[PDB]
Design a protein around this ligand. Structure first.
Ligand SMILES: COc1cc(CCc2cc(NC(=O)c3ccc(N4C[C@@H](C)N[C@@H](C)C4)cc3)[nH]n2)cc(OC)c1
Length: 287
């Protein structure tokens, strides 16, 4: 049995469950329609994403779902994060109701827009995407949240092309474990986070640098064919990824600054938001 929180509770007859969303990257998530989430009006439907537990769910799987919801309540609202919209906690399974992003993850969204062998993104659209992700991250940081897994796969894209950071309310690692696409999350990890288990806003700044690299290569894979052990060796040697093609030196120096050996010397998300805001303004939409 769960305690009823009336700030968030939505009656069960007000949620129409639909087809599963994606390849279960964020757990068991379905598309749904919520009848009257707002008082004006109780007659409007909103497409929402609903997270619930699987059939083979443990008492720990339920505890994590609750913590994530409670965490989302505490963080508050921001344009550039997946927002909590409601929950079904009484007389049945737990349903955590969050914002729906119809264009999928930033890696997919970017990949579908790569020039041929939907539509192409200009040089400004790419800088705008980065600006939005740094904006989202800055909010979470201001609310004391450390993501730990910032990647393009954890950035969802809405129908209106808004960048929304996902999987920010979770708190946990197997270095050899792969993602859905067959990629290794250790590749986005700061060395101090990787070797010393030291997680900070600074280790998230490292990850943002890899995320910018993902935007500028239009969904490129970091370190292809590089196993865990060889990656360790690259980081220890001070190796850094090469400058993507059709990337300015100003933006490559931002990735580099993000990947500073010394965590204190990296820019903050507050600083990144300022720099990217200025760069968006000066970036051409003509190419
Ligand atoms: C903390 O934050 C989170 C995030 C979530 C996820 C919520 C969510 C998921 C989605 N959306 C998709 O999962 C999705 C949708 C479309 C996709 N694509 C597939 C692709 C092939 N074609 C594209 C044209 C569309 C690919 C993926 N919205 N909200 C749940 C959560 O619970 C508490 C907390």
């Amino acid at each position: 049995e769960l305690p009823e929180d009336p700030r968030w509770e939505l009656p069960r007859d007000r949620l129409v469950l639909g087809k599963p969303l994606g390849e279960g990257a964020f757990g068991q998530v379905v598309l749904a329609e919520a009848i009257g989430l707002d008082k004006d009006k109780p007659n409007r439907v909103t497409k929402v994403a609903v997270k619930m537990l699987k059939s083979d769910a443990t008492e720990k799987d339920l505890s994590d779902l609750i913590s994530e919801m409670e965490m989302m309540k505490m963080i508050g609202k921001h344009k550039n994060i997946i927002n909590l919209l409601g929950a079904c906690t009484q007389d049945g399974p737990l349903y955590v109701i969050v914002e729906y992003a119809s264009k999928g993850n930033l890696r997919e969204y970017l990949q579908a827009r790569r020039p041929p062998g939907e539509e192409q993104l200009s040089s400004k659209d790419l800088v705008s995407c980065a600006y939005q992700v740094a904006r989202g991250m800055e909010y979470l940081a201001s609310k004391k949240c450390i993501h730990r897994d910032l990647a393009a796969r954890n950035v969802l894209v809405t129908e209106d092309n808004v960048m929304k950071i996902a999987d920010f309310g979770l708190a946990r690692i197997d270095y050899y474990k792969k993602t859905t696409n067959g990629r290794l999350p250790v590749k986005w990890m700061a060395p101090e986070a990787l070797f010393d288990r030291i997680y900070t806003h600074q280790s998230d700044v490292w990850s943002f640098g890899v995320l910018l690299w993902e935007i500028f290569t239009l969904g490129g894979s970091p370190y292809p064919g590089v196993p865990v052990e060889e990656l360790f060796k690259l980081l220890k040697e001070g190796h850094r990824m090469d400058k993507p093609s059709n990337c300015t030196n100003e933006l490559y120096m931002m990735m580099r600054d993000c990947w500073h050996a010394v965590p204190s010397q990296r820019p903050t998300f507050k600083q990144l938001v300022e720099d990217l805001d200025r760069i968006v303004a000066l970036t051409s939409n003509q190419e």
